[PDB]
């Protein structure tokens, strides 16, 4: 079996810079080598095959090149909408098999969180639980550290943290921090408070509710 | 137009077995053979076998029927390794080699003894906004399994939307929010509404989310 | 236009392993599709002996096997035995000029170490019923000789004769050696207007002469 | 078993038409993809024509592009070619051939058939005459006499020679017929058998050419 391996699970550039993925085999496939786009919750999309020949509708700035064991995959002027994965495959010989895919992420200017925090929802509450939701909106980049404090409290292991992919226009992440508790035990207290520090922060920023006003 | 349209999201238990489905629309099925993949977060893209028209050993069993223009996969006795995203293609024209062009939605194979559960929708109301921007959401709680969909105002509101991936929860159950951001100066001149498809539980929800 | 070049010829002893390379181009086997191998015997079909690069049908020996790298393919046989003897020829598809089933040019596949045969040579005068016809060939046979590289000559009395003469080309009978096929054509003034008439086969630079007179 | 069988091959003036055809059994014609490949006299294999199990494609190779149909019945299990404007050069065995199943990366031809010549040439089919070759000695085993036949001038290829009606096997030998300048082939075939038997037994050898509708039937009797 043909190994396919591409030595950068990550890969970084700008908008309008030139990027350059590397893919070797290890075995002589001449230029039976095909790669493909994959963005978040899509199928693959194919790019390129037989190493340099541009599938239909492909952007002209999707080029490949290479022979024998070294693909190189190109992108002349990257733009916004080029976050992806990208796969390559021999199609030499059987079984069909794919290199490990390399991350596209993009640069750009650092940008400061938007901080929401929602209290749980009287329809929740009836529920007999109590989500607490604080929301980090358009920022870069994806480091980020959320704090949650109740009755200045600091609590630990109670939150949960999901983060979006980042977005296909402004290149920003957006991320979400979850405090659940018992409703009986949401209604003992009377702050509820989450603090975000971000590299475009200044200071940390505090967003906070008294349970009742 | 070539189109392959794949069979929904499955929940298989351990030692169980699922068959899993393609149905092909736009071509003589019996001009192309199809081919079968497995995606997982660990193993990457991994190429299964082909379905020939006119009919991972012991794994997979692969069939196909012209009568429906469909082609087949049976998973057998399933495992935690079986869980994945599944998919099937085509190659883009009869002479090609095996690149693939023409892929399906793909269908995700859950394997797990848990009970399947429809969420309950809570709204995450606005209140009194980073200056200019208001925030507003939907709170998709304790489904099982994946996936769940989420558009808002049955499609028409785009701009501003952040569908955050699931959590898995310490009861083995998923949450997740879908936020929307807009203008201040929107908050009280349109409604606002989450739609919600959780197919595995037959679940529809539209969810009103007023300030 | 393209086709998938092979050596015309491949030798090896009983016992040895040998190859067959089958070089293509970046428009069929260097771009991945697939080479395939057959076997011709002298008057049979052309029979499948590798698909799928590698794979042996059922009732191939495994002393066959495929592979290939780059634009090239190759087909080794180790243990070569004297019934490999025979044609072969890679096969791949080309997609350059809309797309076609190419060939391999061929490779005559010969076990060396065959044991040298003198011929058995027969001679036929014209029969009786011909001279009636108004023509007259004598038939010269060769057979059952190793090699193939034999030599006739034919004399009237003591002299060669000028033309009239055909020759075939030798080929391998079913005991593996070879036979040929040489004719005189004479008028019947000349068949019983000379002595004598002579065939000289030489083979090996052994020469056997068979006289026949009217 | 899987069979193939192709006829129809023969003779043909330069631009005339020819009309091959392969019978199939053994196996689902309509499943697989059929095939046309011919093989030059002592020449390499060359790609002729490909339809589909469906007749829904159809590829030609360059060189009989306008010229040939290719063509498929499936409820008759036949395939057909449709040969027009021949030309000298397309002289060849046709072979019809089954493509075999692959996962992409182009098929093999799996199953071949045993052949049908065409022979485009403006020469005319010509009858052998067939001549006696009397019994001789002098070249064969003790005890045993050599006895031929010898065809002469027919055209085109091939002839068929057996002996005693095909009751007599063992001492046969047909040699391949020569090519004379002329165009015409000439073949000999003897036989040895017991000089013992050379009083009371009869040796016919019988020549088929059934190119041109010839049967002879010749007698050989010692000198």
């Known amino acids: 079996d043909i190994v396919m391996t591409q030595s950068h699970k990550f890969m970084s550039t700008s908008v309008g810079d030139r990027v350059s993925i590397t893919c070797k085999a290890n075995?002589?496939?001449?230029?039976?080598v095909a790669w493909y786009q994959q963005k978040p919750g899509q199928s693959p999309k194919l790019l390129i095959y037989?190493?340099?020949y541009r599938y239909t509708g492909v952007p002209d700035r999707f080029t490949g090149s290479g022979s024998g064991t070294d693909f190189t995959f190109t992108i002349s002027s990257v733009q916004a909408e080029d976050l992806a994965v990208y796969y390559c495959?021999?199609?030499?010989?059987?079984?069909?098999?794919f290199g490990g895919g390399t991350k596209l992420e993009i640069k750009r200017t650092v940008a400061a969180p938007s901080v929401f925090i929602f209290p749980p929802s009287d329809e929740q509450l009836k529920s007999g639980t109590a989500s607490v939701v604080c929301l980090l909106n358009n920022f870069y980049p994806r480091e980020a550290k959320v704090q949650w404090k109740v009755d200045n409290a600091l609590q630990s292991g109670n939150s949960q943290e999901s983060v979006t992919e980042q977005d296909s226009k402004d290149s920003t992440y957006s991320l979400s921090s979850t405090l659940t508790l018992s409703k009986a035990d949401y209604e003992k207290h009377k702050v509820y408070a989450c603090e975000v520090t971000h590299q475009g922060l200044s200071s940390p920023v505090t967003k906070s509710f008294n349970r009742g006003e | 137009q070539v189109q392959l349209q794949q069979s929904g999201a499955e929940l298989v238990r351990p030692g169980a077995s699922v068959t899993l489905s393609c149905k092909a629309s736009?071509?003589?099925?019996?001009?192309?053979?199809i081919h079968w993949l497995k995606q997982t977060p660990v193993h990457g893209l991994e190429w299964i076998g082909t379905?020939?028209?006119?009919?991972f050993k012991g794994k997979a069993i692969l069939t196909a029927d012209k009568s429906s223009s469909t082609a087949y996969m049976e998973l057998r006795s399933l495992t935690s390794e079986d869980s994945a995203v599944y998919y099937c293609?085509?190659?883009?024209?009869?002479?090609?080699?095996?690149?693939?062009?023409?892929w399906g939605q793909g269908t995700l194979v859950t394997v797990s003894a848990a009970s399947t559960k429809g969420p309950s929708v809570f709204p995450l109301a606005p209140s009194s906004t980073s200056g200019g921007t208001a925030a507003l959401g939907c709170l998709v709680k304790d489904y099982f399994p994946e996936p769940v969909t989420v558009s808002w105002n049955s499609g028409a509101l785009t701009s501003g939307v952040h569908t955050f991936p699931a959590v898995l929860q310490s009861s083995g159950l998923y949450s997740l929010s879908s936020v929307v951001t807009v203008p201040s100066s929107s908050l009280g001149t349109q409604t606002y509404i989450c739609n919600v498809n959780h197919k595995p539980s037959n679940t529809k929800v539209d969810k009103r989310v007023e300030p | 236009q393209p086709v998938l070049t092979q050596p015309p010829s491949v030798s090896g002893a009983p016992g040895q392993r040998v190859t067959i390379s089958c070089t293509g181009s970046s428009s069929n086997i260097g771009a991945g599709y697939d080479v395939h191998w057959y076997q011709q015997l002298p008057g049979t079909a052309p029979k499948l002996l590798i698909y799928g690069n590698s794979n042996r049908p059922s009732g191939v020996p495994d002393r066959f096997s495929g592979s290939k790298s780059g634009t090239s393919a190759s087909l080794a046989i180790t243990g070569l035995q004297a019934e490999d003897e025979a044609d072969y020829y890679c096969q791949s598809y080309d997609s350059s000029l809309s797309g076609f089933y190419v060939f391999g040019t061929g490779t005559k596949l010969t076990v060396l170490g065959q044991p040298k045969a003198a011929p058995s040579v027969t001679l036929f005068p014209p029969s009786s019923e011909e001279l009636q016809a108004n023509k007259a060939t004598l038939v010269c046979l060769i057979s059952d000789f190793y090699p193939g590289a034999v030599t006739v000559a034919w004399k009237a009395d003591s002299s060669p004769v000028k033309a009239g003469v055909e020759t075939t080309t030798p080929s391998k009978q079913s005991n593996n050696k070879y036979a040929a096929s040489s004719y005189l054509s004479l008028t019947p003034e000349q068949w019983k207007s000379h002595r004598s008439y002579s065939c000289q086969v030489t083979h090996e630079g052994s020469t056997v002469e068979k006289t026949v007179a009217p | 078993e899987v069979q193939l069988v192709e006829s129809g091959g023969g003779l043909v003036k330069p631009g005339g038409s020819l009309r091959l055809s392969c019978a199939a059994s053994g196996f689902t014609f309509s499943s697989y993809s059929m095939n046309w490949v011919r093989q030059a006299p002592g020449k390499g294999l060359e790609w002729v024509s490909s339809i589909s199990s469906s007749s829904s494609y159809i590829y030609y190779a360059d060189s009989v592009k306008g010229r040939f149909t290719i063509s498929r019945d499936n409820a008759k299990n036949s395939l057909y070619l449709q040969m027009n404007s021949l030309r000298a050069e397309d002289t060849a065995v046709y072979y019809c051939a089954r493509l075999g199943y692959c996962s992409g990366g182009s098929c093999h031809f799996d199953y071949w058939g045993q052949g049908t010549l065409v022979t485009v040439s403006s020469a005319s089919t010509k009858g052998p005459s067939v001549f006696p070759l009397a019994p001789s000695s002098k070249s064969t085993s003790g005890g045993t006499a050599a006895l031929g036949c010898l065809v002469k001038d027919y055209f085109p290829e091939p002839v068929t020679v057996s002996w005693n009606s095909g009751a007599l096997t063992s001492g046969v030998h047909t040699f391949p017929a020569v090519l004379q300048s002329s165009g015409l082939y000439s073949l000999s075939s003897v036989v040895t058998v017991p000089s013992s038997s050379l009083g009371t037994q009869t040796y016919i050898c019988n020549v088929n050419h059934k190119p041109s509708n010839t049967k002879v039937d010749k007698r050989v009797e010692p000198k």
């Open positions: 293609t085509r190659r883009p024209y009869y002479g090609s080699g095996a690149w693939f062009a023409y």
């Open positions: 736009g071509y003589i099925f019996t001009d192309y053979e």
């Open positions: 379905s020939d028209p006119e009919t």
């Open positions: 075995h002589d496939v001449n230029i039976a």
């Open positions: 037989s190493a340099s």
């Open positions: 495959q021999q199609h030499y010989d059987t079984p069909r098999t």
